[PDB]
Amino acid sequence: KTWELSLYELQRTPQEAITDGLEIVVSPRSLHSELMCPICLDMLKNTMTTKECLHRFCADCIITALRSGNKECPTCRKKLVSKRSLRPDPNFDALISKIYPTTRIKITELNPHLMCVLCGGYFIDATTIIECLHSFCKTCIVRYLETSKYCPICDVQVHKTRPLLNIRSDKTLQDIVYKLVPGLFKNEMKRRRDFYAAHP
């Protein structure tokens, strides 16, 4: 895939964090499409992630379907490499252990799981390194990988030559951010509209 950054993506401004503690509500019916396992229909327990498509399942659930199936992804029906294609998602389990309830949550407890260490703000076009499952903004990690072939956090090697081969868009994670953070999807889409209304 061409990781070309648009005119907006080159001059993109971070989405600043909301330090002033706001409490957001989380219903069990909402946030259901991203936190439930599409095999057991329960919330993810010991989350596993596919390197080819970034789809999350339970550790016991995905292992069951692979030993008795076509070694495909149960969601997108893409071909696996049968083994060493599944890496556990530890930072995803931490996010699950924060939001399993039906009460309201302080955003300051959720910010570590929704912020990019490269821009210092919320995730916009969340991209994930499929080797260590560390997520950043699309503009941040692509801008970053022009100079380094290693992860900004755990410092593992992304790829031997072309680091863009081992990154992938994390649509499931980005959908959690736009739903948790109020008005983020509205502000981010207006930022793009204001830019293209002044640079036609």
Q: Give the interface with Zn ion as residue ranges (CB under 5 A).
A: 37, 39-40, 53, 55, 58, 61, 73, 75-76, 116, 118-119, 132, 134, 137, 140, 151, 153-154
Give one DSSP letter per residue of 35-61, joined into a string: HB-TTTSSBPSSEEEETTT--EEEHHH
User: Do 73 and 55 form a contact (C-beta atoms < 8 A)?
Assistant: yes
- Kindly tell me which of 6 and 104 has the beta carbon lying closer to Zn ion: 6
What is the Cα–Cα distance from 38 to 49, expressed in whole angstroms?
A: 13
| Nearest approach, Cβ of residue 194 and Zn ion (Å) | 19
* CB of 92 closer than 8 Å to CB of 34: no
Q: 25 or 70, CB closer to Zn ion? A: 70
Least gap, CB of 4 to Zn ion (angstroms)? 17
Closest CB to Zn ion among residues 26, 130:
130
Smaller CB separation from Zn ion, 23 or 42: 42
CA distance 193 to 105: 31
- Whole-number minimum distance, CB 96 to Zn ion, in Å? 12
> In the bound complex, what is the minimum distance in angstroms from residue 13's beta carbon to Zn ion?
10
Instruction: Give the nearest distance from C-beta 149 to Zn ion in angstroms.
Output: 12
Which of 75, 169 has the CB closer to Zn ion? 75
CA distance 182 to 178: 7
The values of phi and psi at residue 117, to 5°, are -70, -15
Chain Cα centroid distance, residue 168: 9
